[PDB]
């Protein structure tokens, strides 16, 4: 009544405010649509095209991360067209991705792995040669290995909209698009270690935590930070009576998903 509108998700109905996206509605009915570029706190960007769904009686697929929801739209999350779109996007993402999982600190907690296992195919028809990119050096905290970037732009949008640096971008075009700086420049702000958290594919990793463990080993203890007086919520990962790292928690009132480099 208060400008809400009725919409369906595989028949199930839900009333959503105008401007709401397909993704937010599918969430409002408990469904989580795949993602590599939408992060819930960053400007929208329809790059990965992994959020593709079909709308009933609609020919093509829409980007649920950016398409606002219209009245009476039925959203088919688990139909043939959506599945095949996801499989195609996974083929494309993994075409030029390096066989580095067993040396990638992101192993076991990689969104690419889990989304390939849950939404993609189990084979490769790529019979060609992959590419490679010369790694940057942006400081002593963030390790850059850019053969693994899936060009999601999260690092850029975060640096610009949340940290306020505007020193990261995309150099070049086409398949040779090189995310990063154009010159050697240390990206040492006080909200820099969160780019590690929002890079899903291990291109950006913690140099301290490099190689020291794997996510399944760690036991996760919910605690808080003390370096400041904000009271940032954190998770403390331990491995056989030893602190391995500090990883943030979610608290929309304090530290939505961020923490300072001093804290982590």
């Amino acid at each position: 009544a208060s400008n809400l509108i009725e919409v369906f998700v595989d028949g199930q109905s839900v009333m959503v405010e105008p401007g709401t996206t397909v993704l937010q509605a599918c969430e409002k009915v408990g469904m989580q649509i795949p993602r590599f570029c939408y992060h819930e706190r960053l400007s929208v960007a329809g790059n990965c095209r992994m959020c593709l769904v079909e709308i009933e009686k609609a020919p093509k697929v829409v980007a649920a991360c950016a398409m606002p929801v219209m009245k009476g739209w039925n959203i088919l999350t688990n139909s043939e067209k959506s599945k095949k779109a996801r499989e195609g996007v996974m083929e494309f993402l993994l075409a030029n991705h390096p066989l580095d999982c067993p040396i990638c600190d992101q192993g076991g907690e990689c969104d690419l792995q889990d989304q390939s296992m849950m939404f993609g195919s189990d084979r490769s028809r790529f019979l060609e040669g992959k590419r490679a990119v010369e790694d940057k050096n942006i400081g002593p905290l963030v390790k850059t290995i850019m053969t693994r970037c899936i060009q999601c732009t999260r690092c850029i949008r975060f640096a610009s909209e949340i940290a306020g640096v505007d020193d990261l971008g995309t150099t070049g075009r086409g398949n040779d698009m090189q995310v990063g700086t154009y010159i050697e420049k240390m990206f040492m702000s006080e909200l820099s270690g969160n780019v590690i958290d929002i890079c899903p594919v291990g291109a950006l990793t913690s140099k301290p935590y490099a190689f020291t463990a794997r996510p399944w080993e760690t036991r996760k203890t919910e605690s808080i930070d003390v370096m400041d007086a904000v009271g940032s919520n954190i998770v403390v990962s331990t491995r056989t009576g030893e602190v391995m790292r500090i990883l943030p928690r979610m608290h929309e009132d304090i530290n939505e998903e961020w923490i300072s480099d001093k804290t982590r």
Partner: protein
Amino acid sequence: TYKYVNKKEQESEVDMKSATDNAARILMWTELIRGLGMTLSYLFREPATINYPFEKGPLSPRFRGEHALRRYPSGEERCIACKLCEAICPAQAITIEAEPRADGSRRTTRYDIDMTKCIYCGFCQEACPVDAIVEGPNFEFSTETHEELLYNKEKLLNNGDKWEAEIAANIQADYLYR
């Protein structure tokens, strides 16, 4: 389908010949003499006994015995601390601690195997994506002490440097079947 093992017996017909045959069987111990003959035949056969420890029992390349960490022909270690071996080891016998080697490579500091927990299942060498951890052929590695059976990185590396000439050939033989 089915068959009978002890219902073959049909209605009883008896003659003097049959009675006398059963009587001889019961009085001269026919059926036992046959077991005696079998045991006799076995006395004049060649025994299957091998002369251990000089001549030994056969085996196959796939035999999974003692563990060893291998190397590339350059001498560099194959392990990269990916930890699949300890993630799947269903006995929780493997223990690993990694750290950036001075040259920057991803390598281990700890790699321990409680060979009192290993069930010798082979999952670690089929999980290793670099054919580093293997289950060698050696089975004659008994000890007088429990502690000796708790291998570390140096022990496994020495075993690898001791059996490579055999491990590598058995691999070369078996790696097409996988």
